[PDB]
Design a protein around this ligand. Sequence first.
Ligand SMILES: NC1=N[C@@]2(CO1)c1cc(-c3cccnc3F)ccc1Oc1c2cc(C2=CCCOC2)nc1F
Ligand SMILES: *[C@@H]1O[C@H](CO)[C@@H](O[C@@H]2O[C@H](CO)[C@@H](O)[C@H](O)[C@H]2NC(C)=O)[C@H](O)[C@H]1NC(C)=O
Ligand SMILES: *[C@@H]1O[C@H](CO)[C@@H](O)[C@H](O)[C@H]1NC(C)=O
Length: 337
Amino acid sequence: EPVSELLKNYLDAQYYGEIGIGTPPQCFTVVFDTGSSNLWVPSIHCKLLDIACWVHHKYNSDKSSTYVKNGTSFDIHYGSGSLSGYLSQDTVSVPCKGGIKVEKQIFGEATKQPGVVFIAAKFDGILGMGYPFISVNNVLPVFDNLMKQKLVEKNIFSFYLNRDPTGQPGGELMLGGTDSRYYHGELSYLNVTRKAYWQVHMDQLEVGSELTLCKGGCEAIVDTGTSLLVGPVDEVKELQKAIGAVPLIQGEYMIPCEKVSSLPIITFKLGGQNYELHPEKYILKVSKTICLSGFMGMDIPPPSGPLWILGDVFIGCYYTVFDREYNRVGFAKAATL
Ligand SMILES: NC1=N[C@@]2(CO1)c1cc(-c3cccnc3F)ccc1Oc1c2cc(C2=CCCOC2)nc1F
Ligand SMILES: *[C@@H]1O[C@H](CO)[C@@H](O[C@@H]2O[C@H](CO)[C@@H](O)[C@H](O)[C@H]2NC(C)=O)[C@H](O)[C@H]1NC(C)=O
Ligand SMILES: *[C@@H]1O[C@H](CO)[C@@H](O)[C@H](O)[C@H]1NC(C)=O
């Protein structure tokens, strides 16, 4: 009864699986993003002269018998850029072909995607798996709608993200259960503080034994739609100096690959349990073979911030369970090889 969704892994930075929209299903690749709450894919009704209109697969409402028109225009903004379009209603299949059919799901037909962001993305769109409180246009999210249709037993979903770039599979989303093959030991849970993002209280962050960040407590979100670990700019700048990383030309922080195994252990201490990240795990190897820091400084302003983002680096190292029945997040050491 729980549904397994294969995930592809692009350079440890993007994790996306296949879904279907319409009857017959039109296949789209989406990032299952716990940092938003809307489902949107590109539309055929984009414009010939926009470059985003030539990149990803497009929703064609003519070819769907289950399509019904909503038409309400939407406009979505965030850090990297923005997109806009109008809403539609159709059946959503997970996966595109064991699977389930979510009926009467309102989503977004993106007709304009300015910026250079979406050109870099190997995925067509986004399926938000956050709370309804951050859903633009107050659109009932996919997971909320599927639980209303009682399509899985448990009001939970779980993420395995393989941080081995060449390994297979790239990851696995588990709708309605948890996959014990992909984690050792037992799960330990944190209560969600703010039901908007998957927000969590963090007691402190220890970079070795000489630098303590998030001093006196701070707030964090568990976000599968963010590649790296993100914290306040000033705090992460201390972290990069403590590990000796220097900013490159593009902004990435680099550290010589010889010095990796001599770098301190970084412990995220939240909710009575401690979560270790050894230097081999919070430092990425990119191609030349150059080693980059897994941390990124970004000031998220109020009311949402300041926030730490436990992105794919953290989730790829700890199997994560998102639980809407008891509003809590679970962690367990992910199985490797
Ligand atoms: N968690 C998170 N999702 C992102 C940004 O941060 C987002 C992430 C990505 C992204 C990029 C690279 C790898 N993985 C990703 F998920 C791409 C597009 C994108 O685009 C959006 C995102 C979030 C949002 C939200 C809109 C309204 C609610 O607040 C966030 N909107 C987007 F268009
Ligand atoms: C989809 O279109 C409808 C009507 O064009 C929009 O209005 C919703 O309609 C429902 C029908 O029962 C009413 O409860 C409300 O007037 C609206 N619902 C909500 C949740 O706002 C609607 O906004 C559009 N989008 C969605 C996601 O329903
Ligand atoms: C989390 O919240 C639930 C709500 O009742 C409570 O039962 C549980 O003890 C809480 N856990 C912690 C660690 O505070």
